Each structure stands twice: as structure tokens, then as C-alpha cells.
Design an enzyme around this catalytic site. Structure first.
Site, PDB file in Angstrom:
ATOM      1  CD  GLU A  61      -2.752  -0.954   2.643  1.00  0.00           C
ATOM      2  OE1 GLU A  61      -2.593   0.025   3.415  1.00  0.00           O
ATOM      3  OE2 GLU A  61      -3.665  -1.800   2.810  1.00  0.00           O
ATOM      4  CG  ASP A  68      -3.502   7.896   8.188  1.00  0.00           C
ATOM      5  OD1 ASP A  68      -3.557   6.658   8.057  1.00  0.00           O
ATOM      6  OD2 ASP A  68      -3.509   8.679   7.210  1.00  0.00           O
TER       7      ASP A  68
END
Ligand SMILES: [K+]
Ligand SMILES: [K+]
Lengths: 248, 398, 405, 249
Positions: free
Chosen positions: A50, A61
Site C-alpha cells: 500500500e 491515521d
């Protein structure tokens, strides 16, 4: 008919293991060092990489990944550096998807970003803040440029919304969590689709990866790889070797 | 007629607004949306809200003809809609009374909110104390360090205040934390968003709670002046005060509508917060609208002497109204804003918020344009008690 | 409409007889200008056009009427009585003082005066006067003691933003008394073109009556509202008492309601037994001070005792003579409220209702809570919430340990 | 029946001069030193002494006198020290009145203070913040205890009020303030034969003499305080110069 990452999950389930799916952000600690690290993931046994597009305002995040994307942006990372990273991974024989917040994609142009991701050898797009409700343009670009589309589900997702999200996904569904919430969430996807499911759960070790390969088709690992790269590229390789051995 | 579709989009295929949010946020967003759809047509709810607007917040706010400004606006007639006189000193009380009542109807026991220099934080904490809700305000650490008195106001009102030390440690990062808090605490927490932006239903709901400004003003200007105004104007941050005053006039075709936004040192300098004049379309905090963003779509730093006009986005309903040609959006510099601040103090004895002084400065310019006897209604969104030190420095009075 | 004159003083300014409370205890030097203002005001107070001018400004500029808010979340702390807050905190400038300065500034322009002067302590009356002078295009000069100017940098800047000159008095003790002295001396020298805007319901006649006339509106509004919301007249109406303007304004409309108790709450500071207080009725005695015969804090020789309170606005050793009359007549009771009782009420009001009151007004809230306990469940108590507490946030934050060191 | 101060002004007008009226505040720089200064005034040629009662909130006091009254109060001066100063001045062969704001009198008791002033040898009261309109108690006390009552008039005083103030006065009337002062005296003379004292910030012999052409009394205060602060000898010298000034021939 068949997804781009389908043959990878086929190959894993035939070999009695889960896919190891490793995230790194482009430009951390600089652009060349991040490509060197993404290349080292291919060499160390990551099945799918990724490639993270750093964004100034990432909602989803955690702190390790956020400080790294902040550092990357301070160093001048550009969206094109992510596409160059995807090119280098493909040439080295690796399998790359891009993970990005939607505004950088909007700024690039959705059609143009899919065209250029496909031309770089990229296999798909993970979309942490795009839901199927807003994905009309993306669905079209996805089908035009033969890219997989990994939407996220959550513990909180309603039966209606979870079914729609799985129905709109190709390649795999990211089951984002944040102890028995991960396996229940995976179970709910399984009861309505045979699409592969990837689970991220702050994995740090061999033991923790193995724990997730028991129920999930793919074990996703981000934070720990970024922590490891910060110590050094040798540390990243050893850790990736531990995680590859855990998924078996 | 002016409402968006069920997904939150204004203007069909342009797609202004919507929900550019993660799936993790969608259970709680659909829960607020359903609760809002139900309560907006419940008479018990509109009654409770009206009772608080009147007895608690001080509505209606008056409309005041500032005759001593006239000579400075080409002899136009400037009428000030006095939201500066509301409880807490701004229009924001309108938003937070509505959302706080909604939270209590939903069974939420906790409310969170973001804040810049403290204005929406104080307003949210005010509403929560009133209604007996627990309150946590998120505020960037650069802001908490230079707003000790506003932090203390919030604490005095029974709120907790979290200094956010992540990202650039300011308004947008506080919002980013508040969204994370909401996801984790969704069972019991309501998020009181502070402007007419964000993912559906906030732009619509915030606007609906600010509509009262324009509904009053439309009635009041007819009463006092004998006719509809030639123009209605307001300052534009995220867009809550302007949309509130504009809305009742949307179907009056001779009423000009002008939003004034912050130009800082000037748009050409790069040191501004002029979302429509210099930004471009993008997805930000759940809304597709105009945005100050670089060429890769990263958020850029906005600058203004006004803290309340810092928001680098703008509400999606305003982007719709710009595209349709119904509202014009125009830049006002720090200098123009501060000259109008001073002038309103000396001429009318009204110390305006520096945000609201952008609108007053814009009104003076528009007065010179339209000429003698033109009627201009200006939303005076806040009082300037908070800006006395800033203004005093600007004028060399300290 | 011009209101009735049954509670008014005689033509010399006396309440309760030709040598009772009020009057003009001033030098002959001030009497020309005092007679001029008195005649101006006798004319204008019955002029429909003056009252219309004032009403128009009250409505559109100042935002009257102020609401009456039933503070249901205070009830448990007031013996389950019902506390209704008359919200003068929402007025333009954040207090009742705007009612007064609008009236006097209008009267100044009717008299042909181009210039207005006043004095101030912490700054509140100075800011209000300057505000009204900016509105009406009058030259404004505010006298303020050097100890207050140095300690109130932002209120001095407010006044200057509003176009007023602030004269820092650096002579003597450099405090309120030295500023008052300069304002009166300025007035005499410049009586031709200068109007003096007196800050409270005190001083020589006609000021106690005039200032009260300009505050009557609070009580008139409150009488209609409380009957609207409670369905009857209140059992009590209460207010804080400095010089007495906010209190007399809310009391007046209720004076001929014999079932309505009237209670004024005065500043007891550290406590009336400590000698650090401003409890004029509780600890003071009759005397002539600042132009009126009323009560004051004075020593055995009749010197003025220094007063102390955590709030600036109640820190006044005297009280208006109309209040002295209403005390002697048995109509209003005056009671002491300490710094501590006041600050507890301040804090209680922030948490429970989301209203930050002026520390002055917090004395009325604190007394209202006690009066609630006396009168019991369901009693209806109207409290004048005379100002907002923004000016007091720093003082309250220190009190409750919210700043640290 | 004649006023208490009437013989002093008759005696002055028969020697072609104005009375020198000297003011000093009790307790400045302390109680004994102020008494020594007041006694010195009597010895240096003051016809009448104005003994000032220091008050905490004076309106009329100019800055020189206000600094001195503040100091006297910091020194713990009492109202009864003024009564003691009057005794000392009477014992020295002087003539004394008391200048005071009204509140100390109200506090003492008006009748009580009039009695105690008369017993101390005092001849009158000057009441700078008491106007005739508020003076009913004082008129009764003034008549009962045979004390002169000196009210103030000002340049701004209306004809109506100047007449009432002169009519309510006994002994002299205090005309307090370029051409304003002789014009004010002229307006008193038009309606009454009562003596007029003039206060005009007098600090010199020449100023005393200018005022002595049209007024029966020259009142001096600030300058005496300023002189005393320097010292007792400066006060004696100044008073001597002022006494020569009030004499025309
Ligand atoms: K109102
Ligand atoms: K008092």
C-alpha cells in the site's frame, strides 16, 4: 470479470496462508529512501504494498503514520512521487495499490489519476474517506482503467451500508478496526460475499500476524513498518520477514 | 426548493456538499440526519427553540439605522442587524441552541465541538450548561496558549478543554480531533459543528438554525424603511452568519446579496483567507466546496487579522449560490476592515467583531457604488469586546 | 407616556419631607448649572418627543426589551423557589448603564451642550458615557484616577476607540475621588457648553430622580413579563445596590404592589464584622455625601471610611437617597452579601444556566438564592441581572484557580 | 442686634483698610505645629482666622490645601482639635471662625457643634458646601448660640440666589473665584450693606491691595499653607506683607 488482486489471494489461500499487506507513506524520510524501503518490502516477502499518498488533513491515521506523512510533506513530497513509487515496485516484481484521501485525487482529476495509476502498473485504490455514496466518478474510472477498489467497513457499519460497501468493492474490503470486533466484522462480510477481506489492527509481531491470518484473507501492517523504517532499513527487512512467517 | 437532495448535494450534478467522510463516521451521521429530519417538523421542538431564542438568547435582535455612517457610505442608508447583542455576543448562539436541543432529544449526554480563538467553544459550552449536557471543547494548542481567558470562560461554564498538539495545532486540527472523538464515543456523544459546512446534514441544519436572522431582518427593514433593501451583506468564514441573513431574501429578485471575505494583506500577496476569490473546488471536512489548497490538493495556511475568518473552506450552499449568480463574494483587506472597525466605534458607539467589520467595510464601498438613499442591510455578526486589544495595537493606543 | 409622580421628591430634591433625604448638599458655585439641568429635565421628562427619541434608541440601538428568563436550574439551590432573571446583561455595552447614558446624552443635546464629561472607577460608566457620546456626536471627556488607568488598560482603549479623551488624574491618591473632584471642577469652568453625566442614582437633585427615571423601564418591562410567565405578581423583586440605579429602576414599578417584597443586596466584602466591606445600610449611618443626605460609611468624625469589595461597581461608601427613604418607610429591606456568597453564585450561574454574570449582579443572585430558602417552594422571585460578566472573567478565574500562577 | 464680626469690619473701615482674613487647616503639618502657625497669624496681623476642618472628600479645596488636608488626616487629626485650635486663637487675642464641609457638623450634631464652637470662643462658621436651601437646622443653631454664618456666592450666582444667600448671611459673605470679582462684590453691595470678603488665590501684598479697593475683607489660604510648609518664619513674613497690603491709608 476477475479482480486484479484476485490471483494473489488465490495463490495465498492455495498455499495455506494469508496475504501480507504492507503500507508505507511516499516521501518518508525522503522520496528515494521511501522507494528503497518499498522495494525492500517486495524483497522481504510482502505480497501487496500500500503506497500512501501524504495528505495535510488525514482523519483516519494513527500518530506514527501521521508524523511520517507530516515529515514527508515538510520535505516536499508530491502526488507524482507516489506514481513513481508504484512504477518502481511493479518493475521489481511487486504488487502495488495506492491508499489516498480523496481531495488529492479530485485535484489531479479522477479519470486522469486512474489512467496514470494504471500506466504505472498500480492495481487499485484504497479510499479511506470515499464512501460508495460519493463514488460515481470513481466507479467509472475504476472499470475503465481496470483498477480494484478497496472501500472500508467498520464495526459500526449498519447491515445495509456494509452490504452496499462490499457490493461496490473489487479486490478486497479493508476491515478497519478503531478484541473480538475484528473477527465479528470479518464474519459479517463473509456471510454476504466471497470477496477477500484485509484486517489492520496495529500489528507489531509474528504472533499478532498469525492471530489475524486465522480469520482474515490479508493481514495489513502500517504503523509497525513505519516505526521499523525509522530505526533503519535493516530493521524493516527483519520485521517484514517475521510478519511473512507469521501469516503462514 | 433551496434544500439539497437526500445525499446532501446542492445543485444536482455540480455536487456541492455531500458526505466526503469515512465509513466509520456514517452510522452517527445518519443518526443525526434522521433525528434532525424528525425534529425540524416537530412543534414541541420548534416551540422549545423559540422559547429559548426569546427568553434566554435575547431575540429578536434589533435592526439599527446607522445614520452617522451614511456620510462615509456615499449617503446610502446602512442598517445594522444587531446579532452583536445576542447572549454570548454573536450569531453562534443560534446554532448551538438548536444543536444542543437536538442532542438532548437524541439521548446524547455529551457534546463536543471545535473552536478557533474560542467563540464557538464558549457558545457550545453555554448551550450545554443550560441544558445539562457534558461538554468537551477541542482547541488547537497555538490557540489555547494565547486565549487563556476564553479557556477559563469555558471551564467556568463546566466544559473541559483539550489543547490539540497535532498537525498545525489550530482550528482545522481541532476539527480533525473532534471527528476522531465522535467515532470512538458515538453511542453517547453529539458533535456540534460550528459553521454551515461539513458533511450533510450540517450545512443545512446550521443554516436552518441561522435562518431566523434573515426572517427577522426582512420584516424589520420593511417596517422601518418601507420596502425591501437594495442589498443585504455579511462577512463569510465558513458561512453560517451570511447564509442566515441571506436565506429569507433568496426569492426577492431586486435584493442584491454580497458576502465579504477576508483578504488579509491583499489577495495578490498570498497572505489571505479569501476562499472564493483565490481558492478552488475541493473536498474538505466532508464537503465538496471551495477551498484554499495547493496544486496537489493540500490545505494551505490562511492569514487574516480576524481569527474567525481563518477557515480555509467555505459552506457548500454558498458555492451553489455563487455558481447560480445569486450571491457575489468579494475580498476585504485587514486595512479596510480595521478602518471600518474604528469608524463604527467613533460614529455609532458600536464596537464590532473584526469579522463583522469586514462586512461593514464592504457596506461602505457598496454604499458609494449604489448612491444616496440606497438601503443596505448589514449583518453585524458579533461584538468586538474580544478584539479591543488587537484594535488598540493597530491604532497605536497601547 | 409621562409616568406618575407620587414617589417623587419636593422641588428641592427631598424625599419624605422638606429636610429629609436627598437635597442639594453642594457649593453655591455649582448651583447655576444644577438649576439649568433641573429646568431642562422638568421640560423634557413630560415631552412626548423626548420620550419617543429615547424609546427609539432603547428599541433599535440598545435592544430593549430585555427578556425575563426563568432560571429553572437554580431552583434546587434556592429552596425550590422560582428565580426569574431580568436580563440587563443583554443590553448594548453589557449593563443597565446604557439606559442612563442614553437619557442624559439626549438631554445634553436638547440643552445645546456640545461636550459631555463623566468619571469612572474600573471603567464601566466611562465606557457607557463614551458610547452614548459617539452615537450622538458629542465630545466626551472621562476623568479616571491614575491607579485605575494603569490597572484598566483595555477599558481606557475602549473609551479611546469610542473617540473620548481619558484624563488620568495623577494628583492626591490618584483614585475615583480625585477624578470626581476634577469632573465637578471641569463642569463649573465649562458649564456654558458642558454637560455632566452622573453615573448612579445619587448626587444632588435632580440626579437621583433623573437616573431613576431613565431606569424605570427595567421595572415596567419586568412587571408585564413576570405576569406573563408566572401568571401573577412576584412574591419578591431583588437587585444589587451600589449607588442604587439598577435597583431603583427595577423596584419602581412594584412600589404600589403591597404583596411584592423588595430587597436590595449590598456588598459585605470580607464580612461586615471585619471592617472591609461596603455595606452602607447594614453598617453606615445618615450623612451628607456627594451632594445628597443619605446613608454612608463614616467614622466618628464623619470622614468617609474606605470601602472594599471584590466587585468594583458595589465598592461605594454611599447609597442613593431614594433608597434611604424606602428603607426608613419600611418598603424595601437592604441586606449584606459577602465576596464569597457572590462568587459562589457567579460560579453556580455559569454552570447551571450558561450565563456569566457581572460580579455585582452575582450579589443579587446570591441573595435571591437565600431569599428562596426563606420563602420556600414555588415562591416567585424576580432578580435584576444588571450586567454580563466578561469584564470579570479574569477576577473569577483567579478566584476559582483557573489561571494558576 | 449686630453680628459677631461686625466690630472688626467697622474698626477696619474706620482705619481705611480691609480686614486680613487668613485660612490654615487644623493638623497640618501636625496638630501642635498648626496651632503654633495659627497663633503666629494673630501675632503677624491677621484680623480673622479661618480654622479649616480637614475632610476626606473636599470639592472646593484647591490642590495646595487638598495636599495639606490629606496630610493632616494621615496624621490622625480630629474635629475636636479644631475646637482646641479655636481656644488657642481666642487666648492669643485673635478672632476665629471655622471653615468646614457640612458632614462633620452633621456627624457631631449641628446644635452640639454650634454650642461647642461658641464655648471654644469661635465667632462663626463658613459653610462652603451648605447653601441656604439646606440650612434650616444651622440658622436655628446660629441664632441660638450667637454665631455668624458666612455663605458663599459665585460669579455664576443668579440674582434670585445671590439675594437669598446675602439675606441668609451674617458677619460677611464669601465671594469666591479678571473682572469677575469686583463685579460680584458690586452685585452684593447693590442689595446689602453686609461686609464682603474676597478670595482670589492671593499670594502677594500687591494682590491684597487691589482687592482692598472694593472689598471689606481679603481672604488668603493657599499661599499661607505654601508659606507654612517652608516654615514658620516664611509665614510671618508673608502675613506682614499681606497686612500692609490691606491698608490703603
Ligand atoms: K431583545
Ligand atoms: K454601597
Amino acid at each position: 470479470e476477475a479482480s486484479r488482486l484476485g490471483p494473489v489471494f488465490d495463490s495465498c489461500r492455495a498455499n495455506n496462508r494469508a496475504a501480507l499487506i504492507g503500507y508505507l507513506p511516499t516521501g518518508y524520510p525522503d522520496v528515494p529512501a521511501s522507494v528503497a524501503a518499498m522495494t525492500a518490502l517486495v524483497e522481504s516477502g510482502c505480497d501487496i504494498i500500500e503506497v500512501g499518498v501524504p495528505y495535510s488533513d488525514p482523519g483516519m491515521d494513527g500518530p506514527t503514520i501521521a508524523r511520517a506523512t507530516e515529515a514527508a510533506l515538510r520535505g516536499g513530497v508530491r502526488v507524482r512521487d507516489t506514481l513513481a513509487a508504484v512504477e518502481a515496485i511493479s518493475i521489481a516484481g511487486g504488487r502495488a495499490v495506492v491508499m489516498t484521501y480523496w481531495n488529492p485525487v479530485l485535484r489531479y482529476g479522477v479519470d486522469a489519476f486512474a489512467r496514470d495509476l494504471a500506466a504505472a502498473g498500480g492495481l487499485g485504490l484504497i479510499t479511506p474517506d470515499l464512501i460508495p455514496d460519493e463514488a460515481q466518478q470513481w466507479l467509472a474510472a475504476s472499470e475503465e482503467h481496470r483498477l480494484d477498489r478497496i472501500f472500508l467497513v467498520a464495526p459500526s457499519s449498519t447491515p445495509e451500508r456494509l452490504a452496499a460497501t462490499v457490493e461496490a468493492s473489487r479486490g478486497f474490503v479493508y476491515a478497519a478496526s478503531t478484541s473480538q470486533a475484528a473477527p465479528e466484522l470479518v464474519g459479517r462480510v463473509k456471510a454476504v460475499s466471497d470477496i477477500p477481506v484485509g484486517v489492520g489492527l496495529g500489528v507489531r509481531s509474528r504472533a499478532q500476524a498469525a492471530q489475524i491470518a486465522q480469520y482474515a484473507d490479508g493481514v495489513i501492517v502500517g504503523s509497525a513498518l513505519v516505526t521499523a523504517l525509522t530505526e533503519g532499513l535493516p530493521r524493516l527487512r527483519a520485521l517484514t520477514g517475521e510478519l511473512a512467517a507469521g501469516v503462514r | 426548493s433551496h434544500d439539497p437532495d437526500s445525499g446532501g448535494h446542492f445543485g444536482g450534478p455540480s455536487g456541492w456538499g455531500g458526505r466526503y467522510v469515512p465509513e466509520a463516521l456514517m452510522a452517527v451521521i445518519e443518526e443525526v440526519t434522521a433525528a434532525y429530519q424528525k425534529e425540524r417538523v416537530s412543534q414541541d421542538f420548534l416551540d422549545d427553540l423559540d422559547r429559548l431564542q426569546a427568553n434566554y438568547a435575547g431575540r429578536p435582535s434589533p435592526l439599527y439605522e446607522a445614520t452617522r455612517l451614511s456620510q462615509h457610505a456615499g449617503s446610502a442608508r446602512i442598517f445594522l442587524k444587531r446579532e452583536d447583542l445576542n447572549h454570548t455576543g454573536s450569531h453562534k448562539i443560534n446554532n448551538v441552541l438548536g444543536q444542543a436541543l437536538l442532542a438532548r432529544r437524541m439521548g446524547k449526554t455529551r457534546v463536543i465541538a471545535e473552536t478557533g480563538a474560542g467563540q464557538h467553544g464558549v457558545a457550545t459550552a453555554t448551550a450545554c450548561a443550560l441544558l445539562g449536557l457534558d461538554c468537551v471543547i477541542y482547541m488547537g494548542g497555538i490557540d489555547t496558549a494565547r486565549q487563556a481567558l476564553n479557556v477559563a470562560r469555558m471551564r467556568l461554564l463546566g466544559a473541559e478543554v483539550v489543547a490539540v498538539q497535532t498537525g498545525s495545532k489550530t482550528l482545522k486540527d481541532a476539527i480533525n480531533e473532534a471527528f476522531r472523538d465522535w467515532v470512538a464515543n458515538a453511542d453517547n456523544t453529539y458533535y456540534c459543528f460550528g459553521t454551515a459546512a461539513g458533511p450533510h446534514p450540517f450545512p443545512t441544519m446550521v443554516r436552518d438554525f441561522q435562518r431566523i436572522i434573515g426572517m427577522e431582518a426582512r420584516v424589520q427593514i420593511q417596517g422601518q424603511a418601507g420596502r425591501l433593501p437594495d442589498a443585504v451583506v455579511a462577512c463569510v468564514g465558513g458561512g453560517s452568519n451570511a447564509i442566515g441573513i441571506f436565506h429569507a431574501f433568496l426569492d426577492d429578485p431586486g435584493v442584491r446579496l454580497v458576502g465579504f471575505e477576508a483578504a488579509g494583506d491583499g489577495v495578490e500577496t498570498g497572505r489571505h483567507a479569501a476562499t472564493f476569490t483565490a481558492g478552488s473546488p475541493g473536498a474538505f471536512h466532508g464537503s465538496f466546496s471551495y477551498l484554499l489548497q495547493d496544486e496537489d490538493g493540500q490545505t494551505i495556511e490562511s492569514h487574516s487579522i480576524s481569527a474567525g475568518l481563518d477557515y480555509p473552506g467555505v459552506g457548500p450552499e454558498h458555492a451553489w449560490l455563487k455558481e447560480a449568480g445569486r450571491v457575489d463574494y468579494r475580498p476585504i483587506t485587514d486595512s479596510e476592515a480595521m478602518d471600518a472597525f474604528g469608524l463604527l466605534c467613533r460614529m455609532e458607539g458600536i464596537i464590532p467583531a473584526i469579522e463583522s467589520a469586514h462586512a461593514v467595510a464592504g457596506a461602505l464601498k457598496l454604499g458609494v457604488e449604489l448612491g444616496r438613499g440606497a438601503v443596505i442591510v448589514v449583518n453585524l455578526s458579533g461584538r468586538g469586546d474580544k478584539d479591543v486589544e488587537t484594535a488598540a495595537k493597530w491604532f497605536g493606543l497601547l
